[PDB]
Amino acid sequence: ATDDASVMPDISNKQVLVGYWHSWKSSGKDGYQQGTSADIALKDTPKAYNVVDVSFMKGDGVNRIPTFKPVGINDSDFRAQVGALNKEGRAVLLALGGADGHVELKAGDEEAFANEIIRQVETYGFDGLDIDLEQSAITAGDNKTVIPAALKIVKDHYKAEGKNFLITMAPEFPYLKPGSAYESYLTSLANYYDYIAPQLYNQGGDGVWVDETNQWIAQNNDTLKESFLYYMADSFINGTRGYLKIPANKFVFGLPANVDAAATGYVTDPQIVKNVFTRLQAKGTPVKGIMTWSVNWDAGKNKAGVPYNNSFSNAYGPIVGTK
């Protein structure tokens, strides 16, 4: 009974360009600089994105098991769009959480949540799950233990049938410190997760203290963007300067698509990212890729109605080799 969406694409030998895809309909003037995000069908996601994260699986503030249902398209047609990406080797994940996620599981829900993740895979053809909890959801209910527990049941289930169910996370970078609530997600899932993409946007003047240059390097400081990206990566790779350890081969830079997609953290020149990729590779620690919020923003328009014209994927696709 298999079709194109029944496959779970292998990204284990590729760098990724990961884009979030908004499953809801745009509301207009939704941008941080009053632009408008596009209503793009999943199948029309630009080819440079080889991983697409469908946003979001979420709760309802009443019941406990998160769920997802596409808007304005039936299940078989949505699956066919997932199949079309899958056929070209492109993974489609379901993203859990988001702002106003109402994600709040309780001890004993791990099996029912795993079963729900398996029904998503069987119904829509998803290839993995991306943990994208808002700040409040990190330690809400028993999320910290139930979500890892459920995800291990799902990975193991697919591993039995020959498939690699992808597990990713997109934490806000200030939470990736020792003794942090978030640390337990990483250590619980240390042999299960495929990559971690810290969000390097919307955190204002938080950043990293760097002895080498004797400066606080903030995420909203454009003068020092090159240093920010480099030292943030270096800190994760080595578990230094206050940050947890993420292996470079499992590290993705999370960047906003343009100035409408996030309040701060937009990288004004893509050469900056290429210089960092180049430096890291010369040291033998090349990273797994780039992630962006969001495909819909990449295909959206600014407040003056000027299209963004996929300017993010056009610039970074070639840096990670998906274009």
As measured in angstroms, the least distance from the Cβ of 71 to Ca ion is: 20
For residue 134, indicate whether it is catalytic.
yes
Task: Indicate the residue among 130 and 194 with the shorter CB distance to Na ion.
Answer: 194
Q: Which does 125 bind (CB under 5 to 8 A by kind): Ca ion, Na ion, none?
A: Ca ion
The CA-atom distances, in angstroms, between 292 and each of 103, 187, 210 are: 22, 25, 26
| 301 beta partners | 36, 307
Task: Indicate the residue among 126 and 312 with the shorter CB distance to Ca ion.
Answer: 126
The answer to whether 74 contacts Na ion (rule: CB under 5 A) is no
Question: DSSP string of 238-251?
Answer: HT-TT-----GGGB
What is the DSSP secondary structure assignment for residue 65, as one 8-state letter? Answer: S
Greatest Cα pair distance, the chain, in angstroms, is 61
Residue 221's contacts (CB-CB under 8 Å, 6 or more residues apart) are 205, 207, 228
Q: Which residue among 2, 13, 187, 268 contacts Na ion (CB under 5 A)? A: 13
Distance in angstroms (rounded) separating the CA atoms of residues 296 and 301: 10
Task: Candidates 9-17, 27-35, 85-93, 217-225: pick the segment binding Na ion (CB under 5 A).
Answer: 9-17
Which two three-digit tokens encode residue 250?
């499992």
As measured in angstroms, the least distance from the Cβ of 51 to Na ion is: 13
As measured in angstroms, the least distance from the Cβ of 52 to Na ion is: 19
Beta strand 207-210 with 215-218: parallel, antiparallel or unpaired?
Answer: antiparallel
> Which of 88, 111, 134, 212 is an active site residue?
134
Which two three-digit tokens encode residue 207?
């950043």
| 19 beta partners | 52, 292
Residue 264's contacts (CB-CB under 8 Å, 6 or more residues apart) are 201, 202, 203, 204, 219, 220
Q: What is the CA radius of gyration of the chain?
A: 19
As measured in angstroms, the least distance from the Cβ of 12 to Na ion is: 4
Site for Ca ion in 122-151 (CB under 5 A): 125, 127
Q: Which does 127 bind (CB under 5 to 8 A by kind): Ca ion, Na ion, none?
A: Ca ion
Q: Which does 13 bind (CB under 5 to 8 A by kind): Na ion, Ca ion, none?
A: Na ion
5: left (phi over 0), alpha (psi -120 to 50) or beta: alpha
In this structure, the number of other CB atoms found within 10 A of the CB of residue 213 comes to: 11
As measured in angstroms, the least distance from the Cβ of 75 to Na ion is: 32
In this structure, the number of other CB atoms found within 10 A of the CB of residue 175 comes to: 18
In 3D space, the residue among 293, 265, 280 whose CA is nearest the CA of residue 319 turns out to be: 280
As measured in angstroms, the least distance from the Cβ of 121 to Ca ion is: 7
8 Å CB contact between 39 and 45 = no
Q: Which does 12 bind (CB under 5 to 8 A by kind): Na ion, Ca ion, none?
A: Na ion
The answer to whether 2 contacts Na ion (rule: CB under 5 A) is no
Task: Candidates 8-16, 177-185, 200-208, 234-242: pick the segment binding Na ion (CB under 5 A).
Answer: 8-16
| 253 beta partners | 290
Interface map 76-95 toward Ca ion (x if CB under 5 A): ----------x---------
Q: Which does 223 bind (CB under 5 to 8 A by kind): Na ion, Ca ion, none?
A: none
Task: Indicate the residue among 64 and 288 with the shorter CB distance to Na ion.
Answer: 288
Q: Which residue among 1, 7, 9, 12 contacts Na ion (CB under 5 A)? A: 12
The answer to whether 120 contacts Ca ion (rule: CB under 5 A) is no
Report the interface residues with Na ion, using CB under 5 A. Answer: 12-13
Catalytic positions are 134
Report the interface residues with Ca ion, using CB under 5 A. Answer: 5, 86, 125, 127
